[PDB]
Amino acid sequence: GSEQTHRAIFRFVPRHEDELELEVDDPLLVELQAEDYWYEAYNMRTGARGVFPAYYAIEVTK
Amino acid sequence: GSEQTHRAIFRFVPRHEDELELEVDDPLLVELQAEDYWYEAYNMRTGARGVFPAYYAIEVTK
Amino acid sequence: GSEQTHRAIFRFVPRHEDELELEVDDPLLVELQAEDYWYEAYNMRTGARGVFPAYYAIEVTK
Amino acid sequence: GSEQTHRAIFRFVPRHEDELELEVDDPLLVELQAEDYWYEAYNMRTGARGVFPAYYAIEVTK
Ligand SMILES: OC[C@H]1O[C@H](O[C@H]2O[C@H](CO)[C@@H](O)[C@H](O)[C@H]2O)[C@H](O)[C@@H](O)[C@@H]1O
C-alpha cells in the first residue's frame, strides 16, 4: 500500500550504506517481509529508503 | 572487565561484515558504547567480536 | 482456515493456564482477535490452542 | 519511589489477577525482570503494581 505500516521506537544511526536512519516515532512504510530480522522500508519523514533492524519498529495499532 | 555487562533481548543476524550475531539471552561483554548507538562487544557464548544496534541488549541486573 | 495467519515475533512463556506458549517465528492460526487486545490461536508447531497478547504476533505478508 | 526504568509501547488489558494494565507511553518502574520474560512493575501513572509481557516495554535512559 501507500500508508504507514510501522513506527520506529528506537533511534538508529546508519554505519552501513544500505541502512535507513530512524528517529523515534518516525513513520515507516514496509511492504515486504524480512526473514533476516531486517526490514526494508521508506522513512515517510525523511523520504529515504533502506534497511533497519526489525525490532526497532512496531506495527501500527490494529 | 571481562564479565557480562549486557544480555541480548532480540535476535540479530549480521548483514554487514563488522556486525556481531546475537541470539536472545546471549551474554555480552560490551566494550564500546558509541555516540551513534552501535555497541561493540564480545559474545561470550559464541566467542565472536563485532558491533550491533545498542537497543538489542540491556544491562545485567542485581 | 488451515494456513498460517500470523507470525510470533517475541518469545512468550505462559504464566497462566489459558495462555499459548510462543517462540519467535512460530506459525499461528489466529481464530479470534478479541476486543481486549488478546488473540486466541492454534500454534501450528506445538499443536496447542490458547491466548496471548495480540502484539506478540503480526499478520503474515500476503 | 525510584525513577522510571521503562516505557510501555503496546496497550495491555489484563485478563488475569496478577497483571498490570498498560497504556501506550505509560512510565514504568520495573522491580523484577523475571526469567520467563514477564516483568513485575509499578505503573507510575496509575500507581498500580503487577506483571506484564516483557516486550511490551522498552528501557529508557540508554
Ligand atoms: O499442521 C497444520 C495443521 O494443523 C492442524 O491440523 C492437524 O492437527 C490436528 C490436531 O490438532 C490433527 O488431527 C490433523 O491430523 C493435523 O493435520 C489444523 O487443524 C490445520 O488446520 C492446520 O493446517
Q: Which three cell numbers stand for residue C50?
A: 490458547
Resolution, rounded to a tenth of an Å?
Answer: 2.0
Q: Which amino acid is at A27?
A: P
Measured distance CA(C7)–CA(A53) in Å, rounded: 17
- Cβ atoms of C59 and C6 closer than 8 Å: yes
Transcribe D1-62 into DSSP letters: -----EEE-S-B---STTB--B-TT-EEEEEEE-TTSEEEEEETTT--EEEEEGGGEEE---
Nearest to B57 by CA among B15, B26, B35, B36: B26
Residue with CA at minimum distance from ligand 1 atom 6: C2
- Determine the distance separating the centroid of ligand 1 and the alpha carbon of C9, expressed in angstroms: 22
- Cβ atoms of A62 and A8 closer than 8 Å: no
Nearest to C54 by CA among C36, C37, C42, C29: C37
Nearest to B28 by CA among B59, B15, C38, D15: B59
Helix ranges, B1-62 (H):
none
Q: Which amino acid is at D50?
A: G
- Determine the distance separating the centroid of ligand 1 and the alpha carbon of C20, expressed in angstroms: 16
Transcribe chain A into DSSP letters: --S--EEE-S-B---STTB--B-TT-EEEE-S--SSSEEEEEETTT--EEEEEGGGEEE---
User: How far is the CA of D17 from the CAs of A33, A37, C33, D52, in angstroms?
Assistant: 37, 34, 21, 11
Measured distance CA(C14)–CA(C51) in Å, rounded: 9
Q: Which three cell numbers stand for residue A10?
A: 528506537
- Cβ atoms of D60 and D7 closer than 8 Å: yes
Contacts of D58 (CB under 8 A, 6+ apart): A9, A10, B55, D6, D7, D9
Q: Total domain count for chain C?
A: 1
Q: Which amino acid is at C12?
A: F
Q: How long is chain D?
A: 62
Q: Which three cell numbers stand for residue D62?
A: 540508554
From chain A residues 13-32, the ones with a CB under 8 A of any chain C CB are: 32
User: How far is the CA of B8 from the CAs of A19, A24, D62, in angstroms?
Assistant: 21, 21, 14
Measured distance CA(C55)–CA(C12) in Å, rounded: 11
- Determine the distance separating the centroid of ligand 1 and the alpha carbon of C48, expressed in angstroms: 10
Q: Which amino acid is at D9?
A: I
Q: What is the DSSP letter of C21?
A: P
Query: Across the interface, which of A33, A54, A62 has its CB nearest the CB of C61?
Result: A33
Contacts of A43 (CB under 8 A, 6+ apart): A20, A21, A22, A26, A27, A28, A49, A50
In D, minimum Cα distance to A57 occurs at D9
Q: Does C58 touch chain D (CB under 8 A)?
A: no
Q: Residue A26: how many CB atoms within 10 A of its CB?
A: 23
- Show the CA angle centred on residue A35, arms to residues B27 and C41, nearest 5°: 90
- Cβ atoms of A51 and A39 closer than 8 Å: yes
Measured distance CA(A10)–CA(B37) in Å, rounded: 10
- Closest approach atom of ligand 1 to CA C47: 11
Q: How many CB pairs under 8 A join A and B?
A: 37
Q: Which three cell numbers stand for residue C61?
A: 505478508
- Cβ atoms of B3 and B41 closer than 8 Å: no
State which approach was used to obtain the coordinates. Answer: X-ray
Q: How close, in Å, is residue D58 to chain A by CA atoms?
A: 9
> Residue C3 belongs to a domain with what CATH number?
2.30.30.40
Nearest to B55 by CA among A9, A18, A51, A45: A9
User: Range of A47's domain?
Assistant: 1-62
